[PDB]
């Protein structure tokens, strides 16, 4: 924990367009969520003209962003500029150096992704439940980005279920009506396929006689 810079120095370091809050979003970079009340208190302090002021914000504490302090899952539905402010890694690490981070609490680090016309911090990636067709209850939950391909989902299901190289496998998604949609195209993304957290993704394996299990299902 480094000596606190002067107020104007902190403002510039944390806000500037090179290394601070105004830095453009670039795919792959890390950004961190800061609970908005803390950041506004820091802003009032550094704009307040009194380095000794009681408006000093104290340790960063993102407690209100988490569902609980057991698994530290982010609350759903958080809104940038209302619940939290985004800072790039350099600015987050400076703020932690200066003010500290609440003891025992993990940072909230998220990555920029590239969408067709925009870059965005992916605050909420997609957790998919991967299962074999023969046992829909034995799942492995795996996090994927919205920009990952369906092919990566399938390769991941094959790895997690120890599918052998010569076995043939293909994916299905269980939809909200309770039926199955075939994921024919491995080149499209998780976003293109409209997959959602908690969704069941079924890896079907071709039988050794060359027929597929799904031939037996009502179409």
């Amino acid at each position: 924990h480094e000596e606190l810079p002067g107020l104007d120095s902190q403002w510039r370091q944390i806000e500037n367009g090179e290394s601070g809050r105004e830095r453009p979003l670039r795919a792959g970079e890390s950004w961190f969520l800061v609970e908005k009340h803390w950041y506004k208190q820091w802003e009032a302090y550094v704009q307040g003209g009194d380095q000794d002021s009681s408006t000093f914000p104290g340790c960063i504490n993102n407690a209100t962003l988490f569902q609980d302090e057991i698994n530290w899952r982010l609350k759903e539905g958080l809104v940038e500029g209302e619940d939290y402010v985004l800072l790039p890694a350099a600015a987050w690490h400076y703020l932690v150096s200066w003010y500290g981070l609440e003891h025992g609490q993990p940072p909230i680090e998220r990555k920029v992704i590239e969408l067709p016309n925009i870059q965005k911090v992916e605050v909420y990636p997609v957790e998919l439940l991967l299962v074999r067709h023969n046992d829909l209850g034995k799942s492995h939950t795996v996090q994927f980005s919205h920009t990952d391909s369906i092919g990566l989902v399938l390769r991941t299901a094959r790895e997690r279920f120890l599918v052998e190289p010569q076995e043939d496998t293909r994916l299905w998604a269980k939809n909200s009506e309770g039926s199955l949609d075939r994921l024919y195209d491995t080149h499209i993304t998780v976003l293109d396929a409209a997959l959602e957290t908690g969704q069941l993704i079924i890896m079907e394996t071709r039988k050794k006689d060359g027929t597929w299990p799904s031939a037996q299902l009502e179409h």
Binding site: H133, E177, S179, L180, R182, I202, Q216, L217, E218, H219
Partner: peptide, 12 residues
């Protein structure tokens, strides 16, 4: 057996 009871939504 659950998979075999599920319906396949024919694509458009």
């Amino acid at each position: 057996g659950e998979f075999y009871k599920l319906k396949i939504r024919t694509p458009r």
